[PDB]
Design a protein around this ligand. Structure first.
Ligand code: BCL
Ligand code: BCL
Ligand code: BCL
Ligand code: BCL
Ligand code: BCL
Ligand SMILES: CC[C@H]1c2cc3[nH]c4c(c3C)C(=O)[C@H](C(=O)OC)c4c3nc(cc4[nH]c(cc(n2)[C@@H]1C)c(C(C)=O)c4C)[C@@H](C)[C@@H]3CCC(=O)OC/C=C(\C)CCC[C@H](C)CCC[C@H](C)CCCC(C)C
Ligand SMILES: CC[C@H]1c2cc3[nH]c4c(c3C)C(=O)[C@H](C(=O)OC)c4c3nc(cc4[nH]c(cc(n2)[C@@H]1C)c(C(C)=O)c4C)[C@@H](C)[C@@H]3CCC(=O)OC/C=C(\C)CCC[C@H](C)CCC[C@H](C)CCCC(C)C
Ligand SMILES: CC(C)=CCC/C(C)=C/CC/C(C)=C\CC/C(C)=C\CC/C(C)=C/CC/C(C)=C/CC/C(C)=C/CC/C(C)=C/CC1=C(C)C(=O)c2ccccc2C1=O
Ligand SMILES: COC1=C(OC)C(=O)C(C/C=C(\C)CC/C=C(\C)CC/C=C(\C)CC/C=C(\C)CC/C=C(\C)CC/C=C(\C)CC/C=C(\C)CCC=C(C)C)=C(C)C1=O
Ligand SMILES: COC(C)(C)C/C=C/C(C)=C/C=C/C(C)=C/C=C/C(C)=C/C=C\C=C(C)\C=C\C=C(C)\C=C\C=C(C)\C=C\CC(C)(C)OC
Ligand SMILES: [Fe+3]
Ligand SMILES: [Sr+2]
Ligand SMILES: [Sr+2]
Ligand SMILES: [Sr+2]
Ligand SMILES: [Sr+2]
Ligand SMILES: [Sr+2]
Ligand SMILES: [Sr+2]
Ligand SMILES: [Sr+2]
Lengths: 60, 318, 280, 40, 258, 60, 60, 60, 40, 60, 40, 40, 40, 40
């Protein structure tokens, strides 16, 4: 079995509570971060007027 | 005559202290201590050990990256002449993306290093935040620091990221340089019609003055009751002594009211956090809500009128 | 009225001046001979700021007269008067109110002194107070004197004095470059930092997580050593903070003392000594 | 780290399944996102 | 109509919110301020037999409990403290008058010599060993290289007279430093504590001046119920005595000057 | 497998009271945040004057 | 993976937990850094109008 | 009214006194905030000249 | 929280109907507000 | 059948003296507050020049 | 806390009628206010 | 973690249901939101 | 670093294979990246 | 609390008429004020 065949041992070395909650934080921030990244590029989905401009609909 | 408790006149050493012990999960500590007879001349002579976790390493890491972009960039502005770099250093700086770019991620040569250094700096400050909350938990303590750091982080965020995003322009954040960032400050007041008439900036100023007032008063007090071990504030807080008594009484007899060994630390705490919090609010309304504070002050009748003894005709009106 | 532990210290004597004459308390305030001089200086000072507010810069019926708190303002005489006493309704009033303010702060300081002698505590507080009294004096006595006229002093009005600061600041173009200004600002900011750190600490140890007991000195040192590899320790942190705030006041006093009397040019220009060293 | 070898196999097991579930949700989002809006 | 300037802007109302949060903050801080010394002492309270306990505005906050570590106790605030007589008599029968200490001023335990009754237990290290102990009890401690060893200096009072000699050095086992000087008194060879705060060194002469009290007064230094450790009660007791000398130790500190 | 099967055990690891309140904050703040995001974009729903404008509704 | 020496002995020399934390950290930093450098260069892959333009498929 | 049924047990976890006061505060506050939001928008009802202008009840 | 299991049924019941009472008052005021002045 | 019939017990949980004084202050403040709010807008009742102008004890 | 179950039914009672009296005084004021000067 | 093994089954049961309930509230709000003004 | 010579065989074994796996993934990302958009 | 049940009857009695004495002086002054200087 050529693959990490004892890689459970990592939870004998690194405290799991810490690692888990840590991971949650890390994903929530990265999520936040890239969300802002997409908001700063051509790929933006908000200041787009999608699907119809609202700053110029209205009667009136 | 009497010792003033300014300079420890005779010191003593004992084997260094690795500190109160941390729970499982909180990694080892690194470095092994040293003593500086001179820090010792005025304070605990022990230097370190230090704690470094995932948090601490990711923060030192981001922070030093950010420090490199700013620096390397400054050497580039002087042509890699380390001499010239040394000569104009105070005036060197890394300016922000130009407005032409808005909030887009700009090219290396036009501001992208600033956005990267701003990015990495922020991540590193907020990681140091988490660091102090972890280091504060390992000790069973409370998050009072973290609530303050979080306030100063608030001002920071308002200055370089929040106001900019709201204003739709990275050119509005502050540039990294000593003299450059001083200039950013002055231009900021100028652009919005004199920040002195901004109420929030007045409050932040009352609170900065107050941190100096309170810490000077309290600090002078604790020294004046240092004779009774008033510096040992923890037990004067659990078990009131004549230090805390003479302390509360000096002020009571002086200004008519007083606090306690525990409460002065709250007046002081709250006064500092307030500086940064009025301060940030202050930058938040500029451009977002108010564009010319002096005018704002006139609209609310707060600006004084003086006899107009000197005046100039408006060419724009000819 | 007294604290629940106060009577046992309310001893007789310790004066500098007055002796048993004014050696008594009123409510919680200590009077003393200097409380009387102080109250007199203070009362006349305030009562005159009230009269200045009453009369206004052009007379009680003119539109510049005002009782609005943001705008009431009492200003110095013109420079034409130099160090002479100027007519009352032309900045004289401002001069007298100043004499009263200086005298009141000095009485207050001396009364804190008699209070140290009574309570038997160090005199660190009124000495420290004297730094603010000093800064105030440079801003009304030293600078305007060195500058040959009392009008160089700031006016006493909430925002108008802010305006004084503003235009005086701007005569040097970019005040931020004043190096003493740079110092004083550094101390004012750092002072505000240590204070937030000490404040936070005391409150973080005497009130820890539920389930934990009042914390220890060992904790204190271990936390800031954990974070930043160093802890200045309990006594000294009280020492530093006193240093920072008093120094912040110092350098404010010097940064304004040199802005005029010892330097007239813009302040950024001062930094020229650095670009011209024979190194570059 | 106060765990026995059974409580890191167990932990590892549940961790692996949980982690894979989240990651599943991830490829889900990436497929909806890719269909309505390709980035490559 | 696209110009109706509103007189109310976010800046007004943010200044409103601020002042409201402010007032609540101020009030609250003044409440933590009455966790000690309150209710006050008037003859308003005594005249009414007590029906006017003095507390003012705001009022007193519900007690808070401090749970001392090490089988130490539990403290509350605000608490009810047993009155304690004043070891002095009114300079005037009128209220607000100061009181004169009864008997020999340094002995009075009134004025600069007054002090409260702190626990008759010891402050403790983290471990729980007497925090303040002498270098004779704390083996490890050591002078810092390049500092005169106080041990063996001569302690000298305010008038010049020798007082005693440094027989030892007390140290903090928690924050390593000299807290107390030990003094083998000349007049009776009894051992007394001397707070560092009252002590000045004269390193070139190996003397340790003390403006506080006279050489002689060293005879009356409050004493320790054990020569190898000290209690909270005893520290206040030691220091306040020296402090009394600041106003008492001479027939002149009483003031005036003019 | 898509299924957890032993994930009750997570509260053997993470304080439930804390996890709960943590989620409360994170949700209430995120709510505030994104609300503010929408209020600052094209998708805005307050300053639209839809279906009838109130700030120019009077002649007076 | 072809012999080297006794280069396992590194773990008698270097703490495995710390090297773990260090590699996790360093790799995270380098990852974000290079991603942003590339995002800050001509080689950008987002604000390219790829593969269909987004700022002119909704502002219009 | 939970709506069924052992969600009462929630007050076995979070102090009822604290939850109550918390909500009171949060609402007492939010009310003020949104009130202000309305005061700056189309829904403003005071500085509108509604239904008849009052500073034009005379002049000023 | 130093409560018994029966006296958190109680708090819950009273809390819930009261909470819902507030929700009602709000739904009412909002319909009133909606009738007099639509925002959407 | 419902349950708002044990709503007196609130005074077994929340101090009545406190609630009373609280409500009292909160009200006086709210009053001063609203008065100033309207006084800074159009519905003002002081600077209206109603029903007899007083600066009009002349030709004003 | 520290009332009998009886004196908080009483307290609740007096509180309720008194509070309602206040609401009365206010509605009085709001109706006159509406009369002299419609705001909506 | 100051719970018993059964009150990590129980709590969990309640939790799962409550969260799924919130998620219900959310999916509801967003479908309505998509209805009135689609964003994707 | 408190290890015996044997857990420096084990830790090293697992360390080494895991790192070669990560390196594998990297090689993957670089080949995918090289195919779709050459920079050379 | 620190009164008897008889002296809060006594206190309240004296209090109310005293208060109304005040309200009287006020409505009187406001009447005066309203006559010389009507405001609405
Ligand atoms: C230029 C003329 C303008 C002026 C324009 C401004 C502007 C603009 C601002 C101030 C600001 C403030 N002004 Mg001003 N100000 C004026 C004149 C004055 C005067 C005076 C006597 O005249 C005073 C007392 C003040 C007082 C002050 C302080 C009260 C306040 C900021 C407190 C502070 O430190 O925040 C600083 C603290 C922080 C920023 C937090 C620091 C924490 C960060 C995160 C630390 C990270 C450390 C880093 C990671 C370490 C590594 C280093 C890296 C290399 C970067 N101003 C005049 C009117 N002033 C603030 C304000 O009022 O806004 C409304 C502000 O931004
Ligand atoms: C105008 C634009 C220029 C500038 C122009 C000036 C000028 C000009 C001056 C300063 C001054 C100072 N400026 Mg500046 N300043 C600039 C921007 C800044 C910024 C910033 C972030 O940009 C900051 C932080 C500061 C901050 C500072 C400090 C360095 C300093 C003020 C402290 C002081 O005076 O202590 C002194 C404190 C006192 C004098 C108070 C003494 C108290 C007395 C004894 C008692 C008062 C009692 C009274 C009765 C109390 C009321 C209580 C009632 C009884 C109830 N300035 C801008 C760029 N600044 C001032 C200074 O240097 O100080 C002399 C000064 O002259
Ligand atoms: C264009 C944008 C749309 C918009 C689209 C949406 C969408 C889409 C959503 C919302 C939702 C929310 N919107 Mg909206 N919203 C808009 C305009 C508004 C306006 C306004 C001024 O016009 C307001 C006030 C709101 C208000 C809000 C909040 C009511 C809500 C988020 C709650 C929250 O933060 O979680 C914190 C709250 C909780 C965690 C629940 C409270 C639990 C209480 C305290 C517990 C009671 C005790 C309990 C029984 C037992 C204990 C249980 C545990 C404590 C949990 N919206 C406009 C119209 N809005 C979100 C929602 O519905 O809620 C998810 C949502 O999905
Ligand atoms: C410019 C050319 C290509 C590009 C070329 C590459 C290349 C080349 C690589 C990546 C890699 C990464 N890229 Mg890419 N990438 C691009 C566009 C993107 C975009 C986007 C919004 O468009 C995103 C979100 C990502 C995201 C990512 C991460 C998922 C991934 C791992 C690095 C990492 O986690 O960093 C910080 C964290 C670490 C370095 C962790 C180290 C810790 C341990 C040892 C490793 C565990 C990590 C984790 C389990 C791996 C997750 C992903 C697995 C490969 C499935 N790329 C552009 C378009 N990308 C790397 C990768 O795939 O992994 C091999 C990589 O070698
Ligand atoms: C906006 C246009 C109108 C306006 C419309 C209204 C409206 C509408 C209202 C008021 C109301 C009030 N107005 Mg108005 N009002 C205007 C002009 C004025 C002017 C002025 C100078 O022109 C003044 C002074 C006032 C004054 C006031 C207060 C008298 C009153 C609010 C009570 C309160 O807040 O306290 C706080 C109140 C309480 C805490 C409860 C009352 C109980 C009192 C305070 C006793 C406290 C109990 C204490 C424990 C002592 C116990 C007592 C004994 C046991 C018996 N109005 C303008 C002209 N005014 C409000 C009202 O109710 O008055 C009828 C109201 O609804
Ligand atoms: C009440 C508001 C005040 C305030 C509060 C405040 N500041 C704070 C805090 C708080 C509560 C913290 O908790 C935090 C702190 O840690 O306090 C000591 C902090 C902080 N206050 C500081 C700065 C600061 N605060 C300021 C202001 C203020 N903060 C206000 C006065 C100021 C100003 C305006 O003058 C400054 C400059 C920082 C020391 C600290 C935040 C530190 C931080 O975030 O770190 C980020 C990243 C780095 C430092 C990068 C690491 C670089 C290392 C120093 C180098 C070491 C290298 C080593 C040799 C390793 C090998 C390297 C390898 C890569 C080769
Ligand atoms: C020097 C370092 C810091 C410091 C220290 C300090 N200040 C101190 C002390 C200390 C240690 C005291 O012990 C003493 C005190 O009582 O503590 C509050 C004091 C003091 N700090 C105060 C003021 C103060 N300190 C300040 C600042 C500073 N003081 C520095 C930050 C500041 C500012 C500008 O930031 C102010 C405003 C006082 C509350 C108090 C001394 C009070 C006092 O002396 O009262 C006697 C005098 C009066 C009651 C008024 C006299 C009447 C006058 C004739 C009228 C006023 C004239 C005035 C000149 C007009 C100015 C008008 C303004 C609106 C422009
Ligand atoms: C006609 C004629 C006779 C006139 C009538 C006279 C009149 C008008 C009577 C009115 C009398 C009344 C109402 C008041 C008198 C007014 C007086 C004289 C003026 C007040 C002057 C005065 C200094 C006020 C300043 C107020 C402020 C906010 C000062 C700033 C200082 C600060 C922030 C205050 C709170 C914090 C304090 C007090 C800390 C002190 C303090 C510190 C610093 C510790 O370290 C410590 C350590 C351990 C125990 C206790 C303490 C402690 O108490
Ligand atoms: C329980 O208590 C606590 C501790 O104890 C356990 C802590 O350890 C801690 C942790 C605290 C720390 C680790 C402290 C860290 C200190 C910080 C961040 C402050 C930063 C200060 C600096 C970097 C120094 C800047 C100053 C210099 C380099 C020297 C400058 C010298 C100059 C300018 C020339 C000297 C001359 C002057 C200034 C002019 C004259 C001076 C005056 C008039 C001032 C008078 C001062 C006195 C003291 C009487 C806390 C918070 C705590 O609360
Ligand atoms: C030769 O030198 C060697 C050692 C290489 C290195 C030397 C380096 C040196 C000496 C560097 C010196 C640097 C100095 C002195 C810097 C001074 C900086 C100062 C004084 C700055 C003052 C103010 C700056 C502020 C307030 C900056 C704020 C910026 C912010 C908040 C940026 C935020 C950006 C973010 C969060 C980015 C987000 C990116 C997203 C994700 C949105 O992109 C999609
Ligand atoms: Fe302190
Ligand atoms: Sr007038
Ligand atoms: Sr040259
Ligand atoms: Sr819109
Ligand atoms: Sr309208
Ligand atoms: Sr787009
Ligand atoms: Sr009007
Ligand atoms: Sr009139």
């Amino acid at each position: 079995f050529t693959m990490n065949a004892n890689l459970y041992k990592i939870w004998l070395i690194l405290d799991p509570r810490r690692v888990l909650v840590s991971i949650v934080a890390f994903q929530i921030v990265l999520g936040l971060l890239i969300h802002m990244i997409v908001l700063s590029t051509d790929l933006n989905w908000l200041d787009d007027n999608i699907p119809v401009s609202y700053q110029a609909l209205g009667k009136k | 005559p009497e010792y003033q408790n300014i300079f420890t006149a005779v010191q003593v050493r004992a084997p260094a202290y690795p500190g109160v012990p941390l729970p499982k999960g909180n990694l080892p500590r690194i470095g092994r201590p040293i003593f500086s007879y001179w820090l010792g001349k005025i304070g605990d002579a022990q230097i370190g050990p230090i704690y470094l976790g995932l948090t601490g390493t990711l923060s030192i890491f981001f922070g030093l990256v950010a420090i490199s972009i700013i620096g390397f960039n400054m050497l580039a502005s002087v042509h890699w002449d380390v001499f010239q770099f040394l000569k104009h250093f105070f005036w060197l700086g890394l300016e922000p993306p130009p407005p032409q770019y808005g909030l887009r991620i700009p090219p290396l040569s036009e501001g992208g290093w600033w956005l990267m250094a701003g990015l990495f700096l922020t991540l590193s400050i907020l990681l140091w935040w988490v660091r102090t909350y972890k280091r504060a938990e390992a000790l069973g303590m409370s998050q009072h620091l973290s609530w303050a750091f979080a306030a100063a982080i608030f001002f920071y965020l308002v200055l370089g990221f929040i106001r900019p995003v709201m204003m739709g322009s990275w050119a509005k954040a502050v540039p990294f340089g000593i003299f450059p960032h001083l200039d950013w400050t002055a231009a900021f007041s100028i652009r919005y019609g004199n920040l002195y008439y901004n109420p929030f900036h007045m409050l932040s100023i009352a609170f900065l003055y107050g941190s100096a007032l309170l810490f000077a008063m309290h600090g002078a007090t604790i020294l004046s009751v240092s004779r009774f071990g008033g510096d040992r504030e923890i037990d004067q807080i659990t078990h009131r002594g004549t230090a805390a008594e003479r302390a509360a009484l000096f002020w009571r007899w002086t200004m008519g009211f007083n606090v306690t060994m525990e409460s002065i630390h709250r007046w002081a705490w709250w006064c500092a956090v307030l500086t940064v919090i009025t301060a940030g609010i202050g930058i938040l309304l500029s451009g977002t809500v108010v564009d010319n504070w002096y005018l704002w002050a006139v609209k609310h009748g707060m600006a004084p009128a003086y006899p107009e003894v000197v005046t100039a005709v408006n060419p724009y009106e000819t | 009225a007294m604290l629940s532990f106060e009577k046992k210290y309310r001893v007789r004597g310790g004066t500098l001046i007055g002796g048993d004459l004014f050696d008594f308390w009123v409510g919680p305030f200590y009077v003393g001979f200097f409380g009387v001089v102080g109250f007199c200086f203070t009362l006349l000072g305030v009562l005159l700021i009230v009269w200045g507010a009453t009369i206004g810069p052009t007379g009680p019926t003119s539109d510049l007269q005002t009782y609005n708190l943001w705008r009431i303002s009492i200003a110095p005489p013109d420079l034409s008067y130099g160090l002479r006493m100027a007519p009352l309704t032309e900045g004289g009033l401002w001069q007298i109110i100043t004499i009263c303010a200086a005298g009141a702060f000095i009485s207050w300081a001396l009364r804190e002194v008699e209070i140290c002698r009574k309570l038997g505590i160090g005199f660190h507080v009124p000495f420290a107070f004297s730094f603010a009294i000093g800064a105030y004096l440079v801003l009304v006595f030293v600078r305007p004197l060195l500058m040959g006229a009392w009008g160089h002093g700031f006016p006493y009005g909430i925002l108008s004095h802010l305006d004084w600061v503003s235009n005086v600041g701007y005569q040097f173009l970019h005040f931020h470059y004043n190096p003493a200004h740079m110092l004083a600002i550094s101390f004012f900011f750092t002072n505000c930092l240590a204070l937030s750190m000490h404040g936070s600490l005391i409150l973080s140890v005497t009130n820890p997580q539920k389930g934990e007991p009042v914390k220890t000195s060992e904790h204190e040192n271990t936390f800031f050593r954990d974070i930043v590899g160093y802890s200045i320790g309990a006594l000294a942190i009280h020492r530093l903070g006193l240093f920072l705030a008093l120094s912040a006041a110092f350098w404010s006093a010097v940064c304004i003392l040199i802005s005029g009397p010892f330097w007239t040019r813009g302040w950024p220009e001062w930094w020229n000594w650095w670009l011209e060293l024979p190194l570059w | 780290t106060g765990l026995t070898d059974d409580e890191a196999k167990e932990f590892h097991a549940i961790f692996m399944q949980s982690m894979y579930a989240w990651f599943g949700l991830v490829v889900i989002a990436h497929l909806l996102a890719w269909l309505y809006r390709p980035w490559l | 109509s696209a110009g109706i300037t509103h007189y109310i802007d976010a800046a007004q109302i943010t200044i409103w919110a601020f002042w409201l949060f402010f007032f609540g903050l101020i009030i609250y801080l003044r409440r933590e301020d009455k966790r000690e010394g309150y209710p006050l002492d008037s003859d308003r309270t005594e005249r009414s037999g007590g029906r006017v306990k003095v507390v003012g505005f705001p009022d007193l906050p519900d007690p808070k409990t401090f749970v001392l570590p090490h089988n130490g106790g539990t403290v509350v605030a605000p608490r009810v403290e047993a009155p304690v007589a004043v070891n002095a008599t009114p300079f005037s029968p009128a209220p607000g008058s100061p009181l004169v200490p009864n008997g020999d001023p340094m002995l009075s335990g009134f004025g600069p010599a007054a002090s409260p009754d702190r626990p008759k237990h010891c402050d403790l290290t983290f471990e729980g060993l007497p925090k303040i102990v002498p270098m004779r009890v704390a083996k490890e401690f050591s002078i810092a290289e390049g500092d005169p060893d106080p041990r063996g200096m001569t302690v000298v009072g305010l008038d010049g007279e020798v007082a005693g000699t440094v027989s030892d050095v007390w140290v903090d086992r928690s924050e390593p430093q000299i807290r107390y000087l030990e003094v083998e008194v000349a007049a009776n060879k009894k051992k007394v504590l001397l707070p560092i705060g009252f002590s000045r060194f004269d390193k070139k002469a190996r003397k340790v001046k003390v403006d506080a009290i006279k050489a002689a007064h060293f005879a009356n230094v409050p004493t320790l119920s054990n020569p190898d450790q000290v209690t909270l009660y005893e520290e206040d007791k030691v220091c306040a005595y020296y402090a009394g000398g600041k106003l008492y130790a001479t027939a002149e500190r009483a003031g005036p000057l003019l």
